[PDB]
C-alpha cells in the first residue's frame, strides 16, 4: 500500500531516470521503526527514550508509518530508526537533541522530524542549527494546529529558520484543515489519508503534517542520489524554488514539492 502521494510529488520522474535514493542515509526521528515489516528495510538506529531501549520496536505506529513513506518516495534510501518519542507519541526536548546529535555523529544526510511543540528550546534550536551547519538536510512537519486568524501556528522545530517546514495537502492539492500556517511554512506535501506501513506487518492510512514531512525527506533523498555533491542548502533551494504554487503562501508556503523540477 503506497501513498497517492508518490505520484503527486512527481517522485517517479526520478525513478524513471534511474534514481531511487541509493546510498542516502535518512534518519527517522520518531517512535522507532518496527522490525515486523517484510519490505521495510532499516539500515540501523538507536534509542534515546530511557524506558524503551529498542529502536526497532514501534509501540506507537507513527515512526513505522513515516518510515514507509520515506521508502515509498525513495525505495533505495537507507533508513535509520532514531527513537526519540515513546509509545504515547511524546518525547522530551533532550531526547530529540540526543537523536539529532546521533544523526550528525553518524553522518546521516537527511533528518526527518514528524513532531512538534508550541514552544521552542534554545538547546533544540542549537541542535538543528548545528545539523544544518554540518551539511544535513533537516525536514519537519509544520504542525497540526490549523488556523488562528492571522497568527502563525507553525510548531517547533519546524518554526526555526534552519528547518524545512512542511504543510499538508490532500489528493486535490487542497490544504488540510489541520495544517499549520504562517510565514515559516516552506512547502506542502500529501498528508491526508496516506497509506503506509504499520507495526505488526499491517498497512493503513494516517493523516497529519507528520505524513507530509517524509514525502519531502524522501524527495531530498532522491535528489541527493542523483546529485550526491549538492549541498543541503542547494537541495533545500531546489525544492523550494521549483515548488508548484497552490494558493496564498501563508497557507501553502511556496506550494507543492515537485521533485522532477527540483532535480534538474
Amino acid at each position: 500500500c503506497v501513498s497517492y502521494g508518490v505520484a503527486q510529488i512527481k517522485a517517479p520522474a526520478l525513478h524513471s531516470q534511474g534514481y531511487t535514493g541509493s546510498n542516502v542515509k535518512v534518519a527517522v526521528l520518531a517512535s522507532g521503526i518496527d522490525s515486523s515489516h517484510p519490505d521495510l528495510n532499516v539500515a540501523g538506529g538507536a534509542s534515546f527514550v530511557p524506558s524503551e531501549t529498542n529502536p526497532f520496536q514501534d509501540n506507537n505506529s507513527h515512526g513505522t508509518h513515516v518510515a514507509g513513506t520515506v521508502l515509498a518516495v525513495a525505495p533505495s534510501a537507507s533508513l535509520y530508526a532514531v527513537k526519540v518519542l515513546g509509545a504515547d507519541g511524546s518525547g522530551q526536548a533532550s531526547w530529540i537533541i540526543n537523536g539529532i546529535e546521533w544523526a550528525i555523529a553518524n553522518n546521516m544526510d537527511v533528518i526527518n522530524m514528524s513532531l512538534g511543540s508550541p514552544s521552542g528550546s534554545a538547546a533544540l534550536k542549537a541542535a538543528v542549527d548545528k545539523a544544518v551547519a554540518s551539511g544535513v538536510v533537516v525536514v519537519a512537519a509544520a504542525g497540526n494546529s490549523g488556523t488562528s486568524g492571522s497568527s502563525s501556528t507553525v510548531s517547533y522545530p519546524a518554526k526555526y529558520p534552519s528547518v524545512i517546514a512542511v504543510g499538508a495537502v490532500d489528493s486535490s492539492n487542497q490544504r488540510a484543515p489541520f495544517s499549520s500556517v504562517g510565514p515559516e511554512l516552506d512547502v506542502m506535501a500529501p498528508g491526508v489519508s496516506i497509506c503506509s506501513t504499520l507495526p505488526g506487518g499491517k498497512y493503513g492510512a494516517l493523516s497529519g503534517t507528520a505524513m507530509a514531512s517524509p514525502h519531502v525527506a524522501g524527495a531530498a533523498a532522491l535528489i541527493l542520489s542523483k546529485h550526491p555533491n549538492w549541498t543541503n542548502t542547494q537541495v533545500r533551494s531546489s525544492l523550494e524554488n521549483t515548488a508548484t504554487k497552490l494558493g496564498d503562501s501563508f497557507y501553502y508556503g511556496k506550494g507543492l514539492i515537485n521533485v522532477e523540477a527540483a532535480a534538474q
Binding site: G91, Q92, S94, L115, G116
Partner: protein, 71 residues
C-alpha cells in the same frame, strides 16, 4: 516542575565539568550533549535558582514535550 536543560558558557565541553556545576547544587545529570553546550538535568527549585546565578550557566529552560504530528 522538575525536568530541565541547562545551557553552559564556554570551557565546559567535558561532561564531568558540566556535571560538577549541576551536582554541587544537588541537581541530577540526565545527559550531557555532544555538540550543544548544554545538559539535561532534574532540578528542584533551589537548584534552578542557584544555577541561574552561577556564572557558568547560560540558561535554564524546561525540558518540554514534543509530540508526533499525526491527526
Amino acid at each position: 516542575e522538575k525536568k530541565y536543560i541547562v545551557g553552559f558558557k564556554q570551557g565546559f565541553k567535558s561532561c564531568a565539568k558540566k556535571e560538577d556545576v549541576i551536582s554541587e547544587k544537588g541537581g541530577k545529570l540526565q545527559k550531557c550533549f555532544k555538540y550543544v553546550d548544554a545538559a539535561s538535568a532534574t532540578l528542584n527549585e533551589k537548584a534552578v535558582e542557584e544555577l541561574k546565578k552561577d556564572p557558568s550557566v547560560a540558561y535554564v529552560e524546561e525540558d518540554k514535550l514534543y509530540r508526533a504530528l499525526s491527526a
